[PDB]
Write a protein that binds this ligand. Structure first.
Ligand SMILES: Cc1cc2nc3c(=O)[nH]c(=O)nc-3n(C[C@H](O)[C@H](O)[C@H](O)COP(=O)(O)O)c2cc1C
Ligand SMILES: CC(C)[C@H]1CC(=O)c2nnn(-c3cc(F)c(-c4cc(CO)ccc4F)c(F)c3)c2C1
Ligand SMILES: CCCCCCCCCCCC[N+](C)(C)[O-]
Ligand SMILES: O=C(O)c1cc(=O)[nH]c(=O)[nH]1
Ligand SMILES: [Cl-]
Ligand SMILES: [Cl-]
Ligand SMILES: [Cl-]
Ligand code: NA
Ligand code: NA
Length: 366
């Protein structure tokens, strides 16, 4: 319990929520972050938190999930905030505006958010040039254990989804440590159908071919990001395809189109993906299942409702090598990053783990 954590949680964030609608608050958050207007993280990462996965060193396992920095404007500010890795996007091939406003809603009683942004994106070319301006800076960050992920989406009016993703691989693959084939946004019509076995195998074969065609030092890992709302059949199929094709990892999960019993927020019946605490254990269980179905051989980035060391460790023990958060930032602000890391370190020690690596999938070993 630092001074900052309580001040943000009790005073700063609630005031900011009281003054600004969620989307305006997000825009401001991105601006402040990009300008480095936040305390440089006091928490120095211990060796216990280092993870080697996806061909890279991660100095800590807590990343910022896709959707916070959709257009790659705040990457350096986000490392300053203490994230061990940054994922930008989703980025679509052509610029597009997304859905009409309002399209983001706070459920404070639930520590949740509902969003239906619809892939608002500056597009590949703008993001390409943004990353190019700091490409060597990123190379040094990556070498120092702070990798960069790029999450790829598809345009609303695209006729050929696989070609949209292929374009993303070719344009931003060379600038990324890993790419994410996001087939699980609930806010683009027909997108989640790309998670079906036949469609997925064809899509991912094309994506991997394009990736393999990049020069070695510009060749990223490829992960698939999946929904929390999959049937058992869907999960079996995804596991099979991912192993068959040698997909490098999974991101588990996106937001849910379900509305768990017990939501209190007035805005609970808004259309969109639900994030935050009501998603937490649904996500953890999806991690648990996907880890088992892939025999622990496919790295998982665990995401959904993380705002504490316990939340993080539950996902790690269920099978995640790394975790991400987003919605917690809306309620706790920047201090939540150091909080999660500090609490995670303490729990690892308490439960007899030498470090994060020892805890990955530990629940499955009884
Ligand atoms: C406002 C908002 C926008 C998001 N945009 C994206 C996106 O563009 N691409 C994506 O893969 N996930 C997106 N997500 C999903 C998050 O990356 C994450 O998977 C999900 O919110 C669960 O984590 P959380 O409970 O910590 O927020 C978005 C989430 C929110 C709340
Ligand atoms: C969809 C998400 C993003 C929004 C949902 C929502 O309704 C909301 N309400 N407040 N808030 C928010 C506002 C902020 F200004 C910061 C922030 C503040 C500082 C100043 O030290 C530095 C960096 C930051 F990111 C923050 F982390 C979250 C959000 C985010
Ligand atoms: C600031 C509000 C705090 C909300 C904290 C919520 C704790 C977990 C309860 C949500 C569980 C949803 N469920 C049933 C799908 O697991
Ligand atoms: O842009 C959006 O609406 C969006 C994309 C995604 O992948 N997940 C989410 O919750 N929203
Ligand atoms: Cl480049
Ligand atoms: Cl060559
Ligand atoms: Cl209702
Ligand atoms: Na299927
Ligand atoms: Na999370």
């Amino acid at each position: 319990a630092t001074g900052d954590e309580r001040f943000y949680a009790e005073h700063l964030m609630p005031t900011l929520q009281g003054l600004l609608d969620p989307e305006s608050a997000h825009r401001l958050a991105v601006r402040f972050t990009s300008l480095g207007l936040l305390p440089r993280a006091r928490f120095q990462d211990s060796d216990m938190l280092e993870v080697r996965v996806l061909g890279h060193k991660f100095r800590n396992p807590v990343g910022i999930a896709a959707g916070f920095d959709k257009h790659g404007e705040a990457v350096d500010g986000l490392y300053k905030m203490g994230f061990g890795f940054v994922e930008i996007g989703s980025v679509t091939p052509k610029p597009q505006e997304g859905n009409p406003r309002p399209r983001v809603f706070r459920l404070p009683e639930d520590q949740a958010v509902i969003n239906r942004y619809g892939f608002n994106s500056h597009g590949l070319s703008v993001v390409e040039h943004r990353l190019r301006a700091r490409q060597q800076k990123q190379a040094k960050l990556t070498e120092d254990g702070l990798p960069l992920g790029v999450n790829l989406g598809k345009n609303k009016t695209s006729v050929d989804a696989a070609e949209d993703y292929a374009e993303g691989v070719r344009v931003l693959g060379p600038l990324a440590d890993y790419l994410v084939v996001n087939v699980s946004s609930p806010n683009t019509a027909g997108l989640r159908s790309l998670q079906g076995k036949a469609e997925l195998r064809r899509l991912l074969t094309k994506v991997l071919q394009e990736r393999d065609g990049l020069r070695r030092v510009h060749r990223p890992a490829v992960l698939v990001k999946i929904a929390p709302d999959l049937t058992s059949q869907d999960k079996e199929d995804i596991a099979s395809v991912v192993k068959e094709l040698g997909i490098d990892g999974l991101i588990v999960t996106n937001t849910t189109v379900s509305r768990p019993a017990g939501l209190q927020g007035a805005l609970r019946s808004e259309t969109g993906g639900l994030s935050g605490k009501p998603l937490r254990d649904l996500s953890t269980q999806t991690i648990r299942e996907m880890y088992a179905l892939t025999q622990g051989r496919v790295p998982i980035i665990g995401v959904g409702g993380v705002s504490s060391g316990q939340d993080a460790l539950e996902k790690i023990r269920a099978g995640a090598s790394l975790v991400q958060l987003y919605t917690a930032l809306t309620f706790w602000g920047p201090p939540v990053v150091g909080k999660v890391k500090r609490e995670l370190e303490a729990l690892l020690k308490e439960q007899g783990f030498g470090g994060v690596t020892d805890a990955i999938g530990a629940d499955h070993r009884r």
